[PDB]
């Protein structure tokens, strides 16, 4: 029939500011029509790697909920946003499950997220005692204890601060330039699936 109430993909992709990789934003998308061909046919994305589903049948299938996680990482750290990978981002900042169904979309944002003095507003968790579970968020700012001595809240010897900034400057290499990453997670649950694609007339 006549279709209205599109899913809010404009408030995820065209957001004026993105979150850091550690405090990554999660938006739950429900009870609307999700047109995925608008995203797939865009020329503005550098990575559109879909895991567990193909992009051509996304516009056909129907899902219970869509999770849109948004953050900013480096150019060389986009490869770690994948199932089964390793690195600071996967181990300490944002972990994807091995049984992940969804798409990882990344694009260069050197125009927006880099300033000539250095943009220190984007941070990443550099240390933690254990690796993250999938879809876990750690926003704690407690001093990492690398040694036997207690930190006692002061960043002294062997005690460092967990979150470190990426001083994004426009003159950086393509592996150090900021990349905005949106990860869409598609799950089907026993509830009635309501995020369906548009149906042709």
């Amino acid at each position: 029939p006549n279709i209205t109430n599109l899913c809010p993909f404009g408030e995820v992709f065209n957001a004026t500011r993105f979150a850091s990789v550690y405090a990554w934003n999660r938006k739950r998308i429900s009870n609307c029509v999700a047109d995925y061909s608008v995203l797939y046919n865009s020329a503005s994305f550098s990575t559109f790697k879909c895991y567990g589903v193909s992009p051509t049948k996304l516009n056909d299938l129907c899902f219970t909920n869509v999770y849109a996680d948004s953050f900013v990482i480096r150019g060389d750290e986009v490869r770690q946003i994948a199932p089964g990978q390793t690195g600071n981002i996967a181990d300490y900042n944002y972990k994807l499950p091995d049984d992940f169904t969804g798409c990882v979309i990344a694009w260069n944002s050197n125009n927006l997220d880099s300033k000539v003095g250095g943009n220190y507003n984007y941070l990443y968790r550099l240390f933690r005692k254990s690796n993250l579970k999938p879809f876990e968020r750690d926003i704690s700012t407690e001093i990492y204890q690398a040694g036997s001595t207690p930190c006692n809240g002061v960043k002294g010897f062997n005690c460092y601060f967990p979150l470190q900034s990426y001083g994004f400057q426009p003159t950086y290499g393509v592996g150090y330039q900021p990349y905005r990453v949106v990860v869409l997670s598609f799950e089907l649950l026993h509830a009635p699936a309501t995020v369906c694609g548009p149906k042709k007339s």
């Binding site: 990492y144 470190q164 003159t171």
Partner: protein
């Protein structure tokens, strides 16, 4: 938990914050160099002070991790690099005195202005006022005046300063568990802890003497030929049996002999390989020069330049309104930012310099995957040697014919190869005894073998013995004749040029054997050869993570610096010089026979 994991986390935090601070400092230095303005000087000084204070604090914090409880070689290498005191082990008064002495030597060398007595209304600085006179004049007393007046002013200013300098640097070095400052400089080649590939600080002097003993016949024949030609140029001053007069070598100090190519050319009637007019006729921009260099590096299989390289480099002189340093410099600013600062003209020299500096950039790009404190050459010789091999390969007539800059009907006979090899010998072979003699003299000064009242009596004795160059008039101990040169007056190691020269031809033989070149070594071109680039990039990707002996094993298959590739490179010229020196006398006499 364990000390090693603690050191690894400390290195990770170090790396992360260091990379950012080094970037800020390098960008400030770039903005000073492309824009000489006082606020850029202030920003450079602020960034440099922050970088130095951060290195002091991390050196103070790295020492708390003892070395013997760490088994991983790379972690131990980074911790060894970080844990050096430097001048921090010295007292604050003496450290301030040493810094003041270094700065005032820099100002004396940079702002040294000398002109003729009784005509003092205007004077000429060293660059380019005295450089052009030394490189182009044919007058004996004019060159003698310039040489003696510049060593009078500069040496009589710098002699007490250097006497304080040697004592302070020896005090710092013995405070850093070295024998002298010469041992501190030789510690760059020290490899410890690797089975078989260990290299000692004491092995460096023995290897340098052992290689120079094989250098010596080729240099003796070249010296005899240059002596005969300078006797033709200056009829009565030069003796057939004696050393060369010091002020006639084409440069201020005798560092290079490349300004004597006009006087000492074998076959003037034959043409040169100058391609300047050919680029002017085809209207080659400096952008085209760097694009041809990039085409050379992609032909061998190395990665091409980033977009940020073309956006952010200054490859042309900006203009009259904006001032910039004219010296060509390759900048690894950090965070994947690679730039070249060169005021490129349309000449062969600037084209070869573009190849040389892009070789520096390729070397910097290759070890970008390494941790920050391991992002260097394996020693100080490799970093310059990998640029000089590109300068070797690009200068060949096959490369010029391949890129269209030389006529395809250019006749490559033996005479042009002889005079090309002689030009390369005046540049390359002639600097070797001067470099070796200067470093051996500085090592003997730091070791205390030479007392302060006998510095110059030994020095000229060394120059007659090694370089075969005699002083015009005797100098007493009020002179400081070594410190008129840039590197010695500004606290720089000088053995990097000797090691660079030998590593250059070792790398050239290894890559030409990889490229299956079937002719003479100087006729060899490494373009279009993927395997030569792969053999190069295997060493290039290591950086400072591996010992320089193991890197040299990776390229040439030898564990030590070798002299045979250089002698193989100059073998046509060596046979030609042996033929031309039948009537004349090879070797020199240390007596005062030419002039004293």
């Amino acid at each position: 938990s364990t000390i090693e994991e603690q050191a690894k986390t400390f290195l990770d935090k170090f790396n992360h914050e260091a990379e950012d601070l080094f970037y800020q400092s390098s960008l400030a230095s770039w903005n000073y160099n492309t824009n000489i303005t006082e606020e850029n000087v202030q920003n450079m000084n602020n960034a440099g002070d922050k970088w130095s204070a951060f290195l002091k604090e991390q050196s103070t914090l790295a020492q708390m991790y003892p070395l013997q409880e760490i088994q991983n070689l790379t972690v131990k290498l980074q911790l060894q690099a970080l844990q050096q005191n430097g001048s921090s082990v010295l007292s604050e008064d003496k450290s301030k005195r040493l810094n003041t002495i270094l700065n005032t030597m820099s100002t004396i060398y940079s702002t040294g202005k000398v002109c003729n007595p009784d005509n003092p209304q205007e004077c000429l600085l060293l660059e380019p006022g005295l450089n052009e006179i030394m490189a182009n004049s044919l007058d004996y007393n004019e060159r003698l005046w310039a040489w003696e007046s510049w060593r009078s002013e500069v040496g009589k200013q710098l002699r007490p300063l250097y006497e304080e300098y040697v004592v302070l640097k020896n005090e710092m070095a013995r405070a850093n568990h070295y024998e002298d400052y010469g041992d501190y400089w030789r510690g760059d080649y020290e490899v410890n802890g690797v089975d078989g590939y260990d290299y000692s600080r004491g092995q460096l002097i023995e290897d340098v003497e052992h290689t120079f003993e094989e250098i010596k016949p080729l240099y003796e024949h070249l010296h005899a030929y240059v002596r005969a030609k300078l006797m033709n140029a200056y009829p009565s001053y030069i003796s057939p049996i004696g050393c060369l007069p010091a002020h006639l070598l084409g440069d201020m100090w005798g560092r290079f002999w490349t300004n004597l190519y006009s006087l000492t050319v074998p076959f003037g009637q034959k043409p040169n390989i100058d391609v300047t007019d050919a680029m002017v006729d085809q209207a080659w921009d400096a952008q085209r020069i760097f694009k041809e260099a990039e085409k050379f590096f992609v032909s061998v299989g190395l990665p091409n330049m980033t977009q940020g390289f073309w956006e952010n480099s200054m490859l042309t002189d900006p203009g009259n309104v904006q001032k910039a340093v004219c010296h060509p410099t390759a900048w690894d600013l950090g965070k994947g930012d690679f730039r070249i600062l060169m005021c490129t003209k349309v000449t062969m020299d600037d084209f070869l310099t573009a190849h040389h500096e892009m070789g520096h950039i390729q070397y910097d790009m290759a070890y970008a995957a390494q941790p920050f404190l391991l992002r260097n050459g394996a020693n100080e010789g490799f970093h310059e040697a990998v640029g000089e091999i590109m300068s070797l390969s690009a200068a060949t007539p096959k490369h010029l014919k391949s890129i269209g800059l030389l006529s395809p009907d250019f006749q490559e006979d033996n005479e042009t190869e002889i005079n090309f090899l002689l030009k390369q010998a005046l540049t390359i072979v002639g600097t070797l005894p001067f470099t070796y003699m200067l470093e051996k003299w500085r090592w003997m000064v730091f070791k205390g073998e030479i007392p302060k009242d006998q510095w110059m009596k030994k020095w000229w004795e060394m120059k007659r013995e090694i370089v075969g160059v005699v002083e015009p008039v005797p100098h007493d101990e009020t002179y400081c004749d070594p410190a008129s040169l840039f590197h010695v007056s500004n606290d720089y190691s000088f053995i990097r040029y000797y090691t660079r020269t030998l590593y250059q031809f070792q790398f050239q033989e290894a890559l030409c054997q990889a490229a299956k070149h079937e002719g003479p070594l100087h006729k060899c071109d490494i373009s279009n050869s993927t395997e030569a680039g792969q053999k190069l990039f295997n060493m290039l990707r290591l950086g400072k993570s591996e010992p320089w002996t193991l890197a040299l094993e990776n390229v040439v298959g030898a564990k030590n610096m070798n002299v045979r590739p250089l002698l193989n490179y100059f073998e046509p010229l060596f046979t030609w010089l042996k033929d031309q020196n039948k009537n004349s006398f090879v070797g020199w006499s240390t007596d005062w026979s030419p002039y004293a």
